[PDB]
Amino acid sequence: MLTNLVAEPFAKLEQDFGGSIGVYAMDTGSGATVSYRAEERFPLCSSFKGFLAAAVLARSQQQADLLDTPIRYGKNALVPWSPISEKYLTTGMTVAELSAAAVQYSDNAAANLLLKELGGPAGLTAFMRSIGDTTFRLDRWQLELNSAIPGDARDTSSPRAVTESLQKLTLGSALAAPQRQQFVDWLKGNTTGNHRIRAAVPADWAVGDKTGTCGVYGTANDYAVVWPTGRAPIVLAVYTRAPNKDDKHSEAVIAAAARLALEGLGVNG
Numbered sequence: 001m002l003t004n005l006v007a008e009p010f011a012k013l014e015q016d017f018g019g020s021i022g023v024y025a026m027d028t029g030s031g032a033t034v035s036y037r038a039e040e041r042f043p044l045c046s047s048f049k050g051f052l053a054a055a056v057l058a059r060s061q062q063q064a065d066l067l068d069t070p071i072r073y074g075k076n077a078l079v080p081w082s083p084i085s086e087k088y089l090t091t092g093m094t095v096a097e098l099s100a101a102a103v104q105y106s107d108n109a110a111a112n113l114l115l116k117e118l119g120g121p122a123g124l125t126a127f128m129r130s131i132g133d134t135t136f137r138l139d140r141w142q143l144e145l146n147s148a149i150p151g152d153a154r155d156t157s158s159p160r161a162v163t164e165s166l167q168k169l170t171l172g173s174a175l176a177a178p179q180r181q182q183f184v185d186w187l188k189g190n191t192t193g194n195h196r197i198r199a200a201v202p203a204d205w206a207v208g209d210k211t212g213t214c215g216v217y218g219t220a221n222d223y224a225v226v227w228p229t230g231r232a233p234i235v236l237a238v239y240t241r242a243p244n245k246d247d248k249h250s251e252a253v254i255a256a257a258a259r260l261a262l263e264g265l266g267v268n269g
């Protein structure tokens, strides 16, 4: 009854893109939603790292010393796109610092170290199951998890489940209040999303997000919590893919889909 009260031209947008776009957006005040391909699976790519940091925070509720624990690593941990952890190879970083790097710079070495700590892909999947997400699956470590093969359900979720889980973790009760705010603060400090959902959000609204860019099959994504002033927050996810391995992703398409989602919710920007 409250889903897609106002139609938006998502189909034309994905046709111009040459692929598929999946969108879920939730107005947490009224419960109204915008939904387009929202229950289809799309590759997570690096966007799993946000949920990874939330899983670390959940663990820290029972292990008070976890976040400040210092983690040393060898040069063999430094895989492509490890922009923060490469600067601390000779010193180590704390679990909290690795989590922030994974979220805010999509740092691969940091994500791998944290995934190892949580028991690998199955451990992160188990955390998602524990908050009621039955759709998310992480199956591989990097870098193969980003292969984005058409029809492959490994390392995928749906826009809807991503949004529902993000809501639970940032606004709901899945994390204790201090950890919830820390997760929000990490998302707010993300540096990689300025041309995606944030590009559709007025500068005077708060917003946190996590991006993903698989590098193949036109596959890229972003999810975000947005706090418009004077009304309840909006949670949304925008995922893309495309049929050919060399199809390029588009940041502009993600921003445009986010704009349409906000318009469909009647959120004035």
Ligand SMILES: *C(=O)[C@H]([C@@H](C)O)[C@H]1C[C@@H](SCCNC=N)C(C(=O)O)=N1
Pocket: 045, 046, 047, 080, 081, 105, 106, 108, 146, 192, 211, 212, 213, 214
């Ligand atoms: C995750 O999705 C990427 C991982 C596979 O390395 C990671 C890398 C950057 S984007 C890499 C190329 N940049 C632009 N096309 C990234 C991100 O910021 O989303 N995540």
